[PDB]
Amino acid sequence: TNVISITDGQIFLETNLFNAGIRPAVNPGISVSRVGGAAQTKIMKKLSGGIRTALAQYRELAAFSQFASDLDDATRKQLDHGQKVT
Amino acid sequence: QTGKTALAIDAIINQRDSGIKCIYVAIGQKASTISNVVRKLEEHGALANTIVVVATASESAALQYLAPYAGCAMGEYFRDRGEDALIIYDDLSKQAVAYRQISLLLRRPPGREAFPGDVFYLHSRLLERAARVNAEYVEAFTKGEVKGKTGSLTALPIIETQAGDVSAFVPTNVISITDGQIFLETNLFNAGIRPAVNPGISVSRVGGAAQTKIMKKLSGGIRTALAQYRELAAFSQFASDLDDATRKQLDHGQKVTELLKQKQYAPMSVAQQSLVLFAAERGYLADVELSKIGSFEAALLAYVDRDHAPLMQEINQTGGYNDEIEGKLKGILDSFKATQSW
Amino acid sequence: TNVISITDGQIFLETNLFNAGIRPAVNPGISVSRVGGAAQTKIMKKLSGGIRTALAQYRELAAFSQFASDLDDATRKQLDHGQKVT
Amino acid sequence: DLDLAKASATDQLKKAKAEAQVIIEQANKRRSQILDEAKAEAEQERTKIVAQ
Amino acid sequence: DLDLAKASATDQLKKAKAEAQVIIEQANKRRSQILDEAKAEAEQERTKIVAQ
Amino acid sequence: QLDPLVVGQEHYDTARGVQSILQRYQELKDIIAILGMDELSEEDKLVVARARKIQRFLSQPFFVAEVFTGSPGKYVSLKDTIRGFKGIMEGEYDHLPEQAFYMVGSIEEAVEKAKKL
Amino acid sequence: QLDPLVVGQEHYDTARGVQSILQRYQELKDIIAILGMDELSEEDKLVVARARKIQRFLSQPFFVAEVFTGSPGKYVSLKDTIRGFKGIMEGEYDHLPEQAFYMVGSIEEAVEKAKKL
Amino acid sequence: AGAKDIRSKIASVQNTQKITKAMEMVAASKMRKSQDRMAASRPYAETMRKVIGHLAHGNLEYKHPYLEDRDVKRVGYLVVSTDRGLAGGLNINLFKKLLAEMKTWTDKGVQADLAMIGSKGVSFFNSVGGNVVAQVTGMGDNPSLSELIGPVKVMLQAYDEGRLDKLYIVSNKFINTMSQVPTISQLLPLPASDDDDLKHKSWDYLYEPDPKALLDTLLRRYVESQVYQGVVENLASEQAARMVAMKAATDNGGSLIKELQLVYNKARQASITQELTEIVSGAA
Numbered sequence A, C: 001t002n003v004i005s006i007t008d009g010q011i012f013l014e015t016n017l018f019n020a021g022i023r024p025a026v027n028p029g030i031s032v033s034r035v036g037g038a039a040q041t042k043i044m045k046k047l048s049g050g051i052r053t054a055l056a057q058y059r060e061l062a063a064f065s066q067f068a069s070d071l072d073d074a075t076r077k078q079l080d081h082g083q084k085v086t
Numbered sequence B: 001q002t003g004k005t006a007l008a009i010d011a012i013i014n015q016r017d018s019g020i021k022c023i024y025v026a027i028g029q030k031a032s033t034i035s036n037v038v039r040k041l042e043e044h045g046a047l048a049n050t051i052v053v054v055a056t057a058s059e060s061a062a063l064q065y066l067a068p069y070a071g072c073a074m075g076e077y078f079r080d081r082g083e084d085a086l087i088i089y090d091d092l093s094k095q096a097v098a099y100r101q102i103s104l105l106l107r108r109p110p111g112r113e114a115f116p117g118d119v120f121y122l123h124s125r126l127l128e129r130a131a132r133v134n135a136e137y138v139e140a141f142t143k144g145e146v147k148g149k150t151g152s153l154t155a156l157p158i159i160e161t162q163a164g165d166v167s168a169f170v171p172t173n174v175i176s177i178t179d180g181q182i183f184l185e186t187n188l189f190n191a192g193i194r195p196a197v198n199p200g201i202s203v204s205r206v207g208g209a210a211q212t213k214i215m216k217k218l219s220g221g222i223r224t225a226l227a228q229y230r231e232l233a234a235f236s237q238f239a240s241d242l243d244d245a246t247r248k249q250l251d252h253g254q255k256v257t258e259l260l261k262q263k264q265y266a267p268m269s270v271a272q273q274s275l276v277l278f279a280a281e282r283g284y285l286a287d288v289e290l291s292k293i294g295s296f297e298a299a300l301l302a303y304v305d306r307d308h309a310p311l312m313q314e315i316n317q318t319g320g321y322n323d324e325i326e327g328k329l330k331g332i333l334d335s336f337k338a339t340q341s342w
Numbered sequence D, E: 001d002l003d004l005a006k007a008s009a010t011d012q013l014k015k016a017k018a019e020a021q022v023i024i025e026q027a028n029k030r031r032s033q034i035l036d037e038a039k040a041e042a043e044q045e046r047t048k049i050v051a052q
Numbered sequence F, G: 001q002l003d004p005l006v007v008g009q010e011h012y013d014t015a016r017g018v019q020s021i022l023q024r025y026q027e028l029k030d031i032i033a034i035l036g037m038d039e040l041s042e043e044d045k046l047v048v049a050r051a052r053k054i055q056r057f058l059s060q061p062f063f064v065a066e067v068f069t070g071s072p073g074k075y076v077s078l079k080d081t082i083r084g085f086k087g088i089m090e091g092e093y094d095h096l097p098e099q100a101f102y103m104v105g106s107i108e109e110a111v112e113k114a115k116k117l
Numbered sequence H: 001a002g003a004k005d006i007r008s009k010i011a012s013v014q015n016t017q018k019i020t021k022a023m024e025m026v027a028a029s030k031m032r033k034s035q036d037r038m039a040a041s042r043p044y045a046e047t048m049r050k051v052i053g054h055l056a057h058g059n060l061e062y063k064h065p066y067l068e069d070r071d072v073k074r075v076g077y078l079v080v081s082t083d084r085g086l087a088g089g090l091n092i093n094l095f096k097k098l099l100a101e102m103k104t105w106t107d108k109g110v111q112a113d114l115a116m117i118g119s120k121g122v123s124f125f126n127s128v129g130g131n132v133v134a135q136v137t138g139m140g141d142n143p144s145l146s147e148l149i150g151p152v153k154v155m156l157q158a159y160d161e162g163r164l165d166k167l168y169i170v171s172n173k174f175i176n177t178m179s180q181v182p183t184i185s186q187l188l189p190l191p192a193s194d195d196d197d198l199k200h201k202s203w204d205y206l207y208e209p210d211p212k213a214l215l216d217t218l219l220r221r222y223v224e225s226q227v228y229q230g231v232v233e234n235l236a237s238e239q240a241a242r243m244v245a246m247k248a249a250t251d252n253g254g255s256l257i258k259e260l261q262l263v264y265n266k267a268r269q270a271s272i273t274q275e276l277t278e279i280v281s282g283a284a
């Protein structure tokens, strides 16, 4: 925490994801860049959008959407794209 | 932030007409809060009856540490002359901190949590000045000027516990010195229960011996109602599965608990508390719906104040209890429950 | 835990069994002798070879018991035998 | 049974009408007393503040 | 007709009840009116007697 | 000191019997909560009645608590304590209502108090 | 400053209602965590479904956070928010999905966001 | 917090995990016994339905109210629900299916009547203001046909009295140990379901005294037996759902222990450090 308080962001690499073959195991939702898109090339900024909140949402959505699911087509395409992305 | 100060200052306001003088001594608080509570004691009538002793957070440690003794010495002026006083040490948990600072700067050997050794003997010889002295000690002290009256100094120290933890050094000392405890819970305070007193772990070793006998009579049943509710409460999250023979108790508990909620700066005379507890003890609330209990209570307190005032006068003036009084109360409840509305 | 690391076993005396009337309240499973049967006279090494783990299992089977009437008697034989020996 | 039932039928109007009257005749006194006691407080507060 | 009397009586009581419940609300508001009047005339007085 | 050799078998067995009754009543409270009383066996309802009567009979009024409650105190000899609890467990006093045993003192005072209730 | 005598009854009462709901939702998270959401009473499922909306509607987009999220910031007036929370608590927006409330201004941007999913 | 609180919580959660594992075992046995009792029902219903084959929709016809598709002015439902919780979403999925279809029906202006088996549905529809006309409860894990005679008797008596125009049973269908599906399926007027007796034209019965008097009781008994079959399948489905739900809850507890023990170890270490730094930096 002392150092999270000094830097301009963090890339949090999570061991659960890393064991599941997801490498690099960048956990979106905790990791952030406090300078944000100001640093990106215009093309990259355009393409990416707020993608990381999209994957944060997908990953917490998978928290309830394993044993059951609801609104089960729009959540279904949300899950499909999130999975193909990851 | 659970109402520790509010409870003590309502205790002080309520003495605005009772003959008890009040002393409010503030340790280590910021001045613009002292000024605020004084402005509230001035709104209500209480300020003309009370002394305020202030040691703001900016004052040196010696003053913050000695303030409670300066307050006790001002309550003892009354005690030793046959009068009654009430003294409210706000945050003994900050006197203890000031004393720790003074000790560590004098290089005295530290104890647990770096508190010096004699921090028990610091509070012990402060709180044991709160006393009731028999009439003979008064006559001896006042050299015969006052006779047949017993002086008294009542203390209500306040303590603050981190994360509800009562096993720390200063809480565990003052819990050992005092005669009782009012445990204020932050969960009860969030859920809406205000004042948040936790009845299951609050105690008072003086107990019923200090009540008016009407209250002594009526509150015994509240103790048991809440105790049975606290034993049953675990099932509330499976309630639909329960049996009505227990559902009766498990709903009476909730209704009496919803009854003990109260608004701030609105003290009740003994007549009103006795009436409102009698109402719940004798089953009148068995059918009122939970969400309305408060409007029921308000309507009842209003009705009685105009249509039966002499009974309130009698109770408030004597606190007695009789089958006569019980009949009058049953009559009041009967007439109310039919001939009016909430 | 210092001493458990120094010695060659332990006899764990269980308060629950002692209050329940099982005296001596020796607790199987969690108690053990690391020299083992080398120290045990031959007849006892023969007759006792099963007791330990059979009881270790009975004590959990009889803990499953209370939430289950109508027991399979393939297990009721076991719950009777374990109770005999206990 | 015609007499016994029509007795209640002819009486309960009178009775419940009188009680609907009574409820309101109490509420009216409540309003009047509050418009009085707000006057009492109107004097009491101003006198307190001038003394202050 | 028994239950003509019964039902009309119950609703007639309820109407007396509601009429009381609204006789009270005017009372609470009038209190607020007159009490804030007293508050205004108290502050506005104090803050010039003291200036004097 | 609670073992037969020193307290005598009569005492030891009465004590262990009280413990057994109450230890079963603890089991049964949480059946009674979910299912209500009526689903118990005959002896289960009877164990419950005796457990509640024992639990009441262990209360007593003190000559020094005489100032909190007003009720006068009682001194109960050990003979009478054993005789009372054994009589309750055997089912001799099953015909008295529970409140006859609360704050009663000696066991005879239970059979007396039951009259006036 | 959260006193009826300062903020007026309606604002104080709305704030305390929101706190009561969120606390009741905390008290359920252990049973929900263990046994899953299906073992709740039929009225507790509604407490949970409203708390999970109140939590989102407490969210807001900020003018200084466009750097991070693109979405343009919002300014919400008090009058316009005590109404929204009074609404959600009273269950009159109780037909709208959770994600309708996430990162919006007044309650009317939520009712709009629901139409577009 | 502090080690001695968190270790107490870990202990209590491990105990909870014992409880739920025992319940999973129990439910897994009761499901087998209940589906044995589920397969001990087929012979009666199947032979009786073959009989009704020959007697009613045979080459010979008969004039029974319970085989003709008269007009729909109101509809009845027999609702099967568990007597016990912890079943997962079973009951509520079923009641939501029922409510959706009963809405679709009342959108044509028809009324509806409910007869409730099991107490959970009783409470639910008392809350949602359904029209419960009769109920039976407390059958538990020992359903019996004799107890069902009441409500089905009510519904039949209302059907032939004209007051109903169609009758449904709504219940869960046990398919796999891992999958049960809620179904609303019709049983009055009797469905057309193959069972052709064209092959059996070879013979006809001696009817004592007459075929109509029999056909009446045949159909009544047949409806009773299908209601019983439904109750028993729903019971086996309840047991399967409780088994799977307790499995999930035991794994949830098993993960919560992993979280609590990390918190506990952190507290253990912090308490050691803060004790030892208070001692050592006391000296001198």
Ligand SMILES: Nc1ncnc2c1ncn2[C@@H]1O[C@H](COP(=O)(O)OP(=O)(O)OP(=O)(O)O)[C@@H](O)[C@H]1O
Pocket (backbone or CB within 6 Å): B001, B002, B003, B004, B005, B006, B007, B194, B195, B262, B263, B264, G002, G003
């Ligand atoms: N009976 C009550 N009903 C409603 N609100 C109350 C009640 N009592 C206190 N409060 C509220 O709780 C808040 C905290 O009150 P208070 O400051 O007295 O608690 P505290 O323990 O003194 O906090 P601190 O320890 O910071 O002084 C106050 O804003 C007060 O309005």
Ligand SMILES: [Mg+2]
Pocket (backbone or CB within 6 Å): B004, B005, B090
């Ligand atoms: Mg304070």
